[PDB]
Design an enzyme around this catalytic site. Structure first.
Site, PDB file in Angstrom:
ATOM      1  N   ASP A   1      -8.414  -2.983  -1.675  1.00  0.00           N
ATOM      2  CA  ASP A   1      -7.259  -3.850  -1.771  1.00  0.00           C
ATOM      3  C   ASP A   1      -7.289  -4.961  -0.672  1.00  0.00           C
ATOM      4  OD1 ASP A   1      -4.683  -5.100  -2.098  1.00  0.00           O
ATOM      5  OD2 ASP A   1      -3.554  -3.254  -1.753  1.00  0.00           O
ATOM      6  N   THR A   2      -7.788  -6.146  -1.034  1.00  0.00           N
ATOM      7  CA  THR A   2      -7.851  -7.257  -0.073  1.00  0.00           C
ATOM      8  C   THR A   2      -6.472  -7.708   0.380  1.00  0.00           C
ATOM      9  OG1 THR A   2      -7.996  -8.913  -1.826  1.00  0.00           O
ATOM     10  CG2 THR A   2     -10.058  -8.030  -0.995  1.00  0.00           C
ATOM     11  N   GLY A   3      -5.405  -7.371  -0.332  1.00  0.00           N
ATOM     12  CA  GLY A   3      -4.064  -7.653   0.039  1.00  0.00           C
ATOM     13  C   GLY A   3      -3.424  -6.628   0.963  1.00  0.00           C
TER      14      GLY A   3
HETATM   15  C1  2NC Z   1      -0.684   0.924  -5.397  1.00  0.00           C
HETATM   16  C2  2NC Z   1      -0.159  -0.436  -5.167  1.00  0.00           C
HETATM   17  C3  2NC Z   1      -1.392  -1.245  -5.154  1.00  0.00           C
HETATM   18  C4  2NC Z   1      -1.380  -2.098  -3.928  1.00  0.00           C
HETATM   19  C5  2NC Z   1      -0.374  -3.210  -3.975  1.00  0.00           C
HETATM   20  C6  2NC Z   1      -0.788  -3.909  -2.681  1.00  0.00           C
HETATM   21  N1  2NC Z   1      -0.162  -5.201  -2.504  1.00  0.00           N
HETATM   22  C7  2NC Z   1       0.078  -5.696  -1.160  1.00  0.00           C
HETATM   23  C8  2NC Z   1       0.753  -7.030  -1.291  1.00  0.00           C
HETATM   24  C9  2NC Z   1       1.017  -7.636   0.039  1.00  0.00           C
HETATM   25  C10 2NC Z   1       2.037  -8.705   0.009  1.00  0.00           C
HETATM   26  C11 2NC Z   1       3.343  -8.017   0.202  1.00  0.00           C
HETATM   27  C12 2NC Z   1       0.567  -4.723  -0.182  1.00  0.00           C
HETATM   28  O1  2NC Z   1       1.462  -3.786  -0.260  1.00  0.00           O
HETATM   29  N2  2NC Z   1       0.007  -4.733   0.932  1.00  0.00           N
HETATM   30  C13 2NC Z   1       0.447  -3.841   2.062  1.00  0.00           C
HETATM   31  C14 2NC Z   1      -0.131  -2.416   1.993  1.00  0.00           C
HETATM   32  C15 2NC Z   1       0.219  -1.559   3.087  1.00  0.00           C
HETATM   33  C16 2NC Z   1      -0.485  -1.742   4.281  1.00  0.00           C
HETATM   34  N3  2NC Z   1       0.026  -1.326   5.472  1.00  0.00           N
HETATM   35  O2  2NC Z   1      -1.556  -2.225   4.181  1.00  0.00           O
HETATM   36  C17 2NC Z   1       0.407  -4.562   3.473  1.00  0.00           C
HETATM   37  O3  2NC Z   1      -0.610  -5.142   4.012  1.00  0.00           O
HETATM   38  N4  2NC Z   1       1.412  -4.564   4.290  1.00  0.00           N
HETATM   39  C18 2NC Z   1       1.398  -5.003   5.734  1.00  0.00           C
HETATM   40  C19 2NC Z   1       2.277  -6.181   5.851  1.00  0.00           C
HETATM   41  C20 2NC Z   1       1.916  -7.240   4.902  1.00  0.00           C
HETATM   42  C21 2NC Z   1       3.022  -8.190   5.425  1.00  0.00           C
HETATM   43  N5  2NC Z   1       3.075  -9.355   4.515  1.00  0.00           N
HETATM   44  C22 2NC Z   1       3.934 -10.334   4.731  1.00  0.00           C
HETATM   45  N6  2NC Z   1       4.869 -10.203   5.681  1.00  0.00           N
HETATM   46  N7  2NC Z   1       3.810 -11.449   4.041  1.00  0.00           N
HETATM   47  C23 2NC Z   1       1.807  -3.936   6.657  1.00  0.00           C
HETATM   48  N8  2NC Z   1       1.256  -3.714   7.874  1.00  0.00           N
HETATM   49  O4  2NC Z   1       2.677  -3.183   6.277  1.00  0.00           O
HETATM   50  N9  2NC Z   1      -0.320  -3.828  -5.286  1.00  0.00           N
HETATM   51  C24 2NC Z   1       0.810  -4.035  -5.662  1.00  0.00           C
HETATM   52  O5  2NC Z   1       1.624  -3.766  -4.763  1.00  0.00           O
HETATM   53  C25 2NC Z   1       0.869  -4.632  -7.039  1.00  0.00           C
HETATM   54  N10 2NC Z   1       1.235  -3.746  -8.036  1.00  0.00           N
HETATM   55  C26 2NC Z   1       0.480  -3.589  -9.013  1.00  0.00           C
HETATM   56  O6  2NC Z   1      -0.690  -4.078  -9.112  1.00  0.00           O
HETATM   57  C27 2NC Z   1       1.064  -2.585  -9.972  1.00  0.00           C
HETATM   58  N11 2NC Z   1       1.088  -2.992 -11.253  1.00  0.00           N
HETATM   59  C28 2NC Z   1       2.260  -3.401 -11.752  1.00  0.00           C
HETATM   60  C29 2NC Z   1       2.053  -3.945 -13.100  1.00  0.00           C
HETATM   61  O7  2NC Z   1       3.315  -3.280 -11.145  1.00  0.00           O
HETATM   62  C30 2NC Z   1       0.150  -1.344 -10.076  1.00  0.00           C
HETATM   63  C31 2NC Z   1       0.033  -0.701  -8.734  1.00  0.00           C
HETATM   64  O8  2NC Z   1       0.542  -0.209 -10.845  1.00  0.00           O
HETATM   65  C32 2NC Z   1       1.664  -5.924  -7.173  1.00  0.00           C
HETATM   66  C33 2NC Z   1       1.043  -7.206  -6.671  1.00  0.00           C
HETATM   67  C34 2NC Z   1       2.079  -6.319  -8.582  1.00  0.00           C
HETATM   68  C35 2NC Z   1       0.833  -6.809  -9.373  1.00  0.00           C
END
Ligand code: 2NC
Lengths: 99, 99
Positions: free
Chosen positions: A25-27
């Site tokens: 997950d690059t995000g």
């Molecule tokens: C199982 C879930 C899969 C991973 C998740 C990761 N997305 C990122 C998006 C980041 C922008 C918010 C995320 O949570 N990243 C976190 C993960 C947790 C982590 N610690 O790594 C992150 O880096 N968070 C940082 C902060 C990022 C701060 N960002 C900001 N302030 N702009 C942190 N330390 O907490 N994908 C999703 O969250 C996506 N969901 C999906 O792809 C879901 N599909 C549907 C159709 O809902 C599927 C999981 O079933 C979203 C985009 C809809 C398409």
């Protein structure tokens, strides 16, 4: 390997003697697993994503094998719809995104 | 281009005459933007991530330019801590993850 993104980029992982799959997950800044209990001390941590904030356990210096490659790093344990491998560990693999 | 993952993989986008940045997220099925309002009809959609679920608006056949590349696809508009480009649009770029 090189993989396209028509399907979810899921790899096999080995941690604490157990096998699981996880999403590359690059995000994600960090690596978060839900279906694993790890031993020893941890610290509380807060993470955020699409639907809000989760409290998780932070485990440091955890051995983990990702698609065959052994690394040691931080692993968070807590609620997530999917196990995810974030950039903290993908950097250790020398991963790149190409477009 | 080829980018490493020591920093968040953020690119410039152009949508409905406005410029914004967005995160290239291999962990995202769909593309979700927060800081844009789009015109015309939409459908309600539910998405999930870390933290939980979010109701968003689904807009279809939306022109969007991503790091210079013009595509047309589905764009979701709703709450997100970050604008994100998911695999629906990253596949149109021919993106790959390599390690
Ligand atoms: C199982 C879930 C899969 C991973 C998740 C990761 N997305 C990122 C998006 C980041 C922008 C918010 C995320 O949570 N990243 C976190 C993960 C947790 C982590 N610690 O790594 C992150 O880096 N968070 C940082 C902060 C990022 C701060 N960002 C900001 N302030 N702009 C942190 N330390 O907490 N994908 C999703 O969250 C996506 N969901 C999906 O792809 C879901 N599909 C549907 C159709 O809902 C599927 C999981 O079933 C979203 C985009 C809809 C398409």
């Amino acid at each position: 390997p090189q993989i396209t993104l028509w399907q979810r980029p899921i790899v096999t992982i080995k941690i604490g003697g157990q096998l699981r799959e996880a999403l590359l997950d690059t995000g994600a800044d960090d690596t978060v697993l839900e279906d694993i209990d790890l031993p020893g001390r941890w610290k509380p941590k807060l993470i955020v994503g699409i639907g809000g904030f989760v409290k998780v356990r932070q485990y440091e210096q955890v051995p983990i094998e990702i698609a065959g490659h052994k690394v040691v790093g931080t692993v968070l344990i807590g609620p997530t719809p999917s196990n995810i491998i974030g950039r903290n560990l993908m950097t250790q693999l020398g991963a790149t995104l190409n477009f």
